[PDB]
Every structure is written in C-alpha cells, then in structure tokens.
Curated annotation (Swiss-Prot), chain A:
This is DNA-directed RNA polymerase subunit beta. Disulfide bonds: none annotated. The lineage of its organism: Bacteria, Thermotogati, Deinococcota, Deinococci, Thermales. The gene is rpoB. Belongs to the RNA polymerase beta chain family. DNA-dependent RNA polymerase catalyzes the transcription of DNA into RNA using the four ribonucleoside triphosphates as substrates. The RNAP catalytic core consists of 2 alpha, 1 beta, 1 beta' and 1 omega subunit. When a sigma factor is associated with the core the holoenzyme is formed, which can initiate transcription.
Swiss-Prot record, chain B:
Belongs to the RNA polymerase beta chain family. DNA-dependent RNA polymerase catalyzes the transcription of DNA into RNA using the four ribonucleoside triphosphates as substrates. This is DNA-directed RNA polymerase subunit beta. The RNAP catalytic core consists of 2 alpha, 1 beta, 1 beta' and 1 omega subunit. When a sigma factor is associated with the core the holoenzyme is formed, which can initiate transcription.
Curated annotation (Swiss-Prot), chain C:
This is DNA-directed RNA polymerase subunit beta'. Belongs to the RNA polymerase beta' chain family. It comes from the Bacteria. The chain holds residues 842 to 894 of 1524 of the full protein. DNA-dependent RNA polymerase catalyzes the transcription of DNA into RNA using the four ribonucleoside triphosphates as substrates.
Swiss-Prot record, chain E:
This is DNA-directed RNA polymerase subunit alpha. The gene is rpoA. The keyword Transcription applies. The lineage of its organism: Bacteria, Thermotogati, Deinococcota, Deinococci, Thermales. It catalyses: RNA(n) + a ribonucleoside 5'-triphosphate = RNA(n+1) + diphosphate. It is an enzyme of class 2 (transferase). Residues 1-226 are annotated as: Alpha N-terminal domain (alpha-NTD). It comes from Thermus thermophilus (strain ATCC 27634 / DSM 579 / HB8). GO terms for biological process: DNA-templated transcription. Keywords: DNA-directed RNA polymerase, Nucleotidyltransferase, Transcription, Transferase. The N-terminal domain is essential for RNAP assembly and basal transcription, whereas the C-terminal domain is involved in interaction with transcriptional regulators and with upstream promoter elements. Its EC number is 2.7.7.6. One of its GO terms (cellular component) is cytoplasm.
Length: 48, 48, 53, 94, 226, 52, 228
C-alpha cells in the first residue's frame, strides 16, 4: 500500500521537535508570502 | 499574509525551510476497536 | 474618547487604534481609561455568562 | 454540560442519588416504550434525522428532562417494589 | 456533481439584530463569503452621524458647562449615540437646534423638528440641567460611510464649533461563523452564519442586502480591459 | 451509505469513556459525547489535556 | 463627489501562463475585499483537466518495473501527473491518449498520438527512458474536473489492469495580489489592486479570472430569497 500523509501521522525534525498532523488545510487557507507562495507546515513557537 | 482574510499577520513571522521526517509510527497501524472476539482459555477474559 | 465599546472596536476595525492602545471608553456608565483589548475581553466574559453586571 | 445539571444537583442531598433516580426512571421509560412519560407532547426530546424530527431514543435524556419538570416523586420507601410494577403495568400495558 | 443551491434563512429580532444562515456551501466558501461581506458591512453601508456641535458659552471640548451635570465630553459622547435618518435623498446635511432651561432632563426629542429628518431614538439622554442652567446647541448631522475621527474631517460650521467623531456606519457590529456540515457522504461542506448588529436606522437584512449589492457592483469592474 | 446514517442515530445522546495511561488520578478517565469524524485518530478537547 | 467612479481595468499578459490585472482607483480597504475572495476561488474552484487513469501493457500494478525501461511505474505515473492537456472543445469531458514507443529513446509528452480538439501544452515533458529492447505501450486517460480527487476516491479504471492516478484538476498554479497606495483628486487613501495569476497554459489567466468572478457572482445570488 502507498501511504500518504494524514491526520494522526507523526512528523519530526532532527532537533527533537516531534508531533502528529492534526489538520490538513487547503492551499488557499495557509499563510502565504506576498509573492503568493503558501507555507507547507505551521509549527507552534511555544515548543521552543 | 493570512490566507482566509487576506490581511497581514500583525507581526513579522519566522518563515523558513526545514527538513522534516515522517516517522514509522502511523495511526493506520494503531487504530483498533472491538465489541466481542477471542477469549482466554483459563480466565475466559478477552485476549489482548 | 469612545461613547461605547462597539465604537471603540469599530475604530480598531478601521485601523484608527490598536487593541493595545490606551484610550477612554464609556462602559456601564463609567468613563474607563483602558485599551480596546481589555474592553473586548470584558465583552467576551459578559456574553459567555450572559450577565453584563 | 448536561442541560439543567446545576438544578438537578440541587434537587437531591447526595449527587449519587440523582444518578440512581435518573437511571431507574430511564428503565421505566424503556420498559413501557416511553408511554408513561410525564412530558407533554411539546416537551418530548427530539433527534434530527434525515427524514425528519423523531422522538429521542435515549431514555437517559428523557429521564433528565422529566426530573427538571418537577412532576416526578422520588425517595425511599415510597411504595412496595412488587406493587409498583403491578400498578404501572395496568396503567401502561406493554 | 455540483453542489445544490444553499438555503438562506433569516432569524431577525426587531430592527437591530439578526442571524442569517447559508448552507450547505462548498468547502472553504464560508470564509470566502463571510470575510468580504463583513468588511463591507463595517465600512461601506451609507449612514448619518453628528459631525459638529456648537454650545453657547463653551470654548473647548475639555471645558465644563455651569448648571449642567454633564461636562462637554459627556454631552458629545451622548450625541455620538444619536440615530437620525434623512427622509429626503436630496438632503445631505442638516443642523439640529436645541434650547433647554433647567432643571429639566434634555432628551433627543427636545431637538427642534426638521422636515425630512426623523430621530430614530427620541428617548436618548443628552444632558441634565439644574436651576439657572442653560443649554444652547447647534449639532450638524452629515451623510457618510465608515468611521471618521474628528481630527480627520475637522468639520466646523461657526467659530468655537467642536468637531465630533463621525460614526457614519449604521452597522454596530458584525460576527460571522463557519461550521462543518455534511450532505450525505460529503463531509467537508461549510455552513455560514452571519450575525449583524445595527443602530435601528437600517434593518440588519437591509444592511446585508446593501453589502451584497456593493460586492456585486464591484465584480462588474472586471469587464472592459484598458 | 445508510449504515453511517443509522450509526449516527445509535450514538445519539450516548457517551464514551476516554482513558490515558498512567491513570494517576480520577481525571484520567472522562466521559465525552462522541462526534463521528472521518479519519483514524481521536480528537481531544484542548482544555482536558492538562487533566489527562 | 465621495462616490468614487468606476475604476479603469488594465490587463497585462505574457503568453498563456502569466497575467496581471490592475483595478484602480478603489475605496480604502477594497483591495483586500476584492482580491482575497478571488484568490481563494482561483486556487480551489477553477475547473481543469488531469490524468485519472493510466494503463501500461504487461503491467498489473504500479509497484512493478517494465523491462528495458529505466523508471518504474510509480515514477512514470509521477511524471504523468505533470502532463498539461488543454481541451479545445468545451463539451469534451474525457480523452484517452495512446503512446507507443520502442527503445532506445527518451519518450517525451510529444510522443502521444494526436487527438482531435486536444493539445499537449508541454511536449518536452519527460515520461520515461527506453533502453534498447524496451517497449512502452500505455493508454493515459485525461478527465475534466475541479479540485483534488485522490485515486482512492474516484477509482477510475478503463480496464482490468488500469492504475488510478490522483487527480489535481486545478489549472491555476499561483495567485498573488498587491495593494498599492493610489491617490485620486484630493483623496489619498485610495487603493490600487493588482492580481497576479500563474497558470499551466491550459487555461489563460484571464479565462481563470473571469470564471472566478462568475463563481463569486453566482454565490452572491444565494442571499436573495430568505427562508423566514
Ligand atoms: Mg495539472
């Protein structure tokens, strides 16, 4: 089976920051740069 | 900018590119429910 | 100097002032000296419990 | 929170007596098919279904709403256990 | 399989509050519709407001009138709450005259009647007088949209006139909500709820119609390139 | 597809108990009214995370 | 008067993939009021065409490799998701493109057999590398729709061994709008709105813009007949 990312899957970076996907937003809902580029992941600053 | 309202976030945000790994722990392999099923030999309690 | 909290938060909508700016607002008969953010918080609690007093 | 939970907790001296009253009343409603309810037709709980609004099937919801009305009597040593069931059967045959 | 047209329901109480529900909507269209309408309701609906007041024997807005409990600031704050509706589209600006003798309690109904002008709230409290108190006023009511501070327009009729913040918008407050709805196996649908508070001069439904019209009129601007 | 409509009726009014181990105090078990959702993960209210 | 007149529209286009649409002068705050609703509609609700099913001869599933072909089926299908097909017929709903190649060659999107009223917008797209003795005979099904439909949802298989492909029908690639400070007469708070639209070429930015305006315009007619 080819598994795509879904709500409840666990993501992490190399610096010990880990969490579960809790929301998958449509592209038009994500914050974007003034040039029109949406971001891919939103991380809480309270974890640092 | 906010994708829903179109207005800017009131403060500048730390936007960047980060390397994120998808870990082996997936909710697909962990969701489980039961109503009735196998029972133990001696105690007759549900199996685990 | 705002006549009521709705007028103060209407000015916030138009960008006249920020929620953190200290202004004068007339709330419950008292001429308070607070920010629209604190008047907004008071309205938040009043509506959840449905008792302004 | 359950609707009127504050009022329900104030009708009994012990919070665990309210659970006994509601749980026992719910069984009376289930056993007689909700025909013994003290709720008026305009007060019956309803559930939104695709076809339309029908009576709520949850008897614990019915018991809690009935208790708030004040048309139920509860206590200890009200009537004999055997006699209560016999009388209820006659009034609401099932 | 395009989604069916949503059902628009209105739950209006009086002439100052109302709730409007539009459902079901395609995913994300509650925000697509609620945000543009909310911005128009709070900034573009035409209205009237007091933009200037003249009080005899009053020099500056931070003074105090002898014989009246309220100071100049408090009287001005009361005027900001006045709701006036022009009954003649040609009429653009009017002046309201108020003369009172103590120790009466001045109300909005004490204003001298003016043709084609209706005071929506005549029971509004303006000032309180005592024996020997005098209140001569000349309030100038204009037509406009949005919120305009006194320092911005700076409207003065005669010398010693006091500019007042012009609350032109008849809509007091707008709050829209989006909830998840489902139509069978479609679960990402949207339900839009729009709550509008008004001063009573225009009903919330009237305001909503004007906001929808204003957005529609602007969409016709994408018509003739160059 | 009618099974899911019937399920929405079965759970109406009912509650379920959510349990997280270790159950240090009694607030480690709490009753909630389920909202049937698409997916495979349980959604937990933010305000009950400290108790759990 | 305070009633601002009709703005002047301005269109600047670079081929079929970029377009700038300027609308000025506007009232204060209408740049965001008009720009954002259009941007949300453009990014989600604009119909397009996508590959929904691919059949490769002698291949049973997508977890296999084709003898003589450098890429596996998973990689080939990923390349096919980048194919841009423009239907010249408004009534056309589906088309099957046939590719028949033999090694040694690099099969591009220009190797598909021609179809009537169908044009490939990126003929240089790389599909597969064929080594000597390798053959690639596949049928690609291109549908028309809106949004993002995963292959698990539509499950389209023209035949037994066809492989459903996740469909991203949206033709718009990126949308951005800029609000500048323009002044008209004695009013200096006015707005100038600039929509920047990037498309894949199947739908020109102007066509996508017009559809977005119509979608918003039709949604505004749902506030007409209250049910109360
Ligand atoms: Mg595409």
């Amino acid at each position: 089976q080819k598994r795509k990312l879904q709500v409840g899957d666990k993501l992490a970076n190399r610096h010990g920051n880990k969490g579960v996907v809790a929301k998958i937003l449509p592209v038009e809902d994500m914050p974007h740069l003034p040039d029109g580029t949406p971001v891919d992941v939103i991380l809480n600053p309270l974890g640092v | 900018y906010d994708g829903r309202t179109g207005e800017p976030i009131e403060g500048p945000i730390v936007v960047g590119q980060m390397f994120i790994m998808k870990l082996y722990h997936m909710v697909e392999d962990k969701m489980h429910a039961r109503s009735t099923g196998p029972y133990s030999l001696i105690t007759q309690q549900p199996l685990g | 100097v705002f006549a009521n909290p709705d007028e103060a938060l209407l000015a916030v909508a138009h960008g006249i002032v920020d929620l953190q700016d200290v202004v004068t607002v007339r709330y419950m008969g008292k001429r308070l000296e607070t920010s629209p953010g604190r008047i907004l918080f008071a309205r938040i609690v009043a509506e959840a419990v449905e008792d302004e007093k | 929170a359950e609707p009127g939970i504050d009022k329900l907790f104030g009708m009994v001296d012990s919070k665990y007596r309210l659970t006994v009253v509601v749980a026992k009343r719910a069984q009376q409603l289930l056993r007689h098919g909700f025909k013994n309810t003290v709720l008026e037709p305009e007060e019956r709980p309803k559930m939104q279904t695709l076809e339309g609004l029908f009576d709520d099937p949850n008897a614990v919801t019915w018991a809690m709403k009935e208790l708030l009305t004040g048309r139920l009597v509860f206590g200890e040593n009200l009537v004999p256990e055997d006699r209560l069931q016999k009388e209820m059967e006659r009034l609401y045959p099932v | 399989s395009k989604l069916k047209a949503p059902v628009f329901t209105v739950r209006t109480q009086g002439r100052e509050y109302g709730e409007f529900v539009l459902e079901p909507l395609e995913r994300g269209f509650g925000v697509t519709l609620g945000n543009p309408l909310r911005r128009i309701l709070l900034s573009s609906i035409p209205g009237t407001a007091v933009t200037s007041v003249y009080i005899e024997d009053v020099l500056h807005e931070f003074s105090t009138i002898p014989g009246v409990k309220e100071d100049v600031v408090e009287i001005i704050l009361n005027l900001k709450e006045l709701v006036v509706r022009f009954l003649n589209p040609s009429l653009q600006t009017v002046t309201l005259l108020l003369k009172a003798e103590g120790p009466k309690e001045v109300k909005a109904r004490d204003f001298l009647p003016v043709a084609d002008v209706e005071i929506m709230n005549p029971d509004l409290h303006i000032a309180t007088l005592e024996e020997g108190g005098r209140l001569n006023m000349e309030v100038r009511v204009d037509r406009g949209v949005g919120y305009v501070p006194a320092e911005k327009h700076g409207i003065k009729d005669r010398i010693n006139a006091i500019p007042v913040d012009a609350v032109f918008s008849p809509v007091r407050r707008v709050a829209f909500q989006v909830e998840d709805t489902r139509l069978g196996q479609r679960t990402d649908l949207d339900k839009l709820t729009l709550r509008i508070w008004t001063d009573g001069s225009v009903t919330p439904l009237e305001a909503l119609n004007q906001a929808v019209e204003i957005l529609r009129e602007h969409l016709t601007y994408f018509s003739n390139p160059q | 597809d009618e099974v899911w409509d019937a399920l929405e009726e079965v759970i109406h009014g009912k509650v379920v108990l959510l349990n997280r181990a270790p159950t240090l105090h009694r607030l480690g078990i709490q009753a909630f009214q389920p909202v049937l959702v698409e997916g495979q993960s349980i959604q937990l209210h933010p305000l009950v995370c400290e108790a759990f």
